[PDB]
Ligand SMILES: O=C(O)c1ccc2c(=O)c3c(Cl)cccc3oc2c1
């Protein structure tokens with residue numbers, strides 16, 4: 001599991017459960033090709049998106065469907081989605097966690113990259 | 116101007132100066148059409164992107180070129196850019212400040228919307 005996504009809710013103080021997440025990889029023609037997707041679990045985590053063999057160097061986009069999340073909770077949101085765009089670089093063994101903390105008019109994201 | 120962008124640097128505790136910002140608007144064919152662009156000043160602020168006439172309803176994407184910013188400071192950062200995607204003016208004109216706070220492996224963004 002080289003890529004995991006974790007989503008937290010800053011309003012309710014909880015994991016963000018059942019959030020749709022789509023991962024795309026940038027193609028040679030600069031378009032975004034679907035790569036993996038899923039919904040966060042009760043812990044706010046989305047595991048099993050990809051494998052070591054599939055996850056090659058490149059530019060990836062993680063789109064978190066925050067608008068649908070807030071709407072399911074009855075809360076008025078600002079963003080259409082949260083988008084995290086990054087380069088995967090093979091500098092020895094690495095596992096990537098893309099984490100996001102959501103509020104209705106703000107989000108924060110960090111990368112936790114470990115060996 | 117109804118759209119302002121402000122960027123801060125969380126490593127230095129300073130405005131993020133000379134950050135390139137590109138704004139796109141979703142077209143009727145669902146592609147991202149260029150809308151406006153500029154760069155942050157010595158205060159970290161970007162004024163004058165657009166006008167009340169040009170800033171119509173739509174879905175907008177504000178791309179903040181964080182990688183180019185860090186690279187100019189001699190730092191290899193994680194993200195390619197920070198992306199802020201939102202529907203604007205759906206209930207009439209508003210003024211939007213899109214703020215971002217940058218670190219090499221993380222960013223936060225918030226919107227301040229006023230009438
Ligand atoms: O990976 C985890 O377990 C984990 C735990 C805590 C956080 C967290 O508090 C956090 C904050 Cl403030 C801002 C932006 C992203 C974040 O991501 C996290 C991720």
Ligand SMILES: O=C(O)c1ccc2c(=O)c3c(Cl)cccc3oc2c1
Pocket residue numbers: 121212214215216223224225
């Ligand atoms: O518009 C301003 O003047 C302004 C002032 C402070 C902040 C700020 O601290 C801040 C933080 Cl912590 C996290 C994410 C976005 C932010 O945007 C700001 C914007």
Ligand SMILES: [Ca+2]
Pocket residue numbers: 057089090
């Ligand atoms: Ca490389």
Ligand SMILES: [Ca+2]
Pocket residue numbers: 172204205206207
């Ligand atoms: Ca409308």
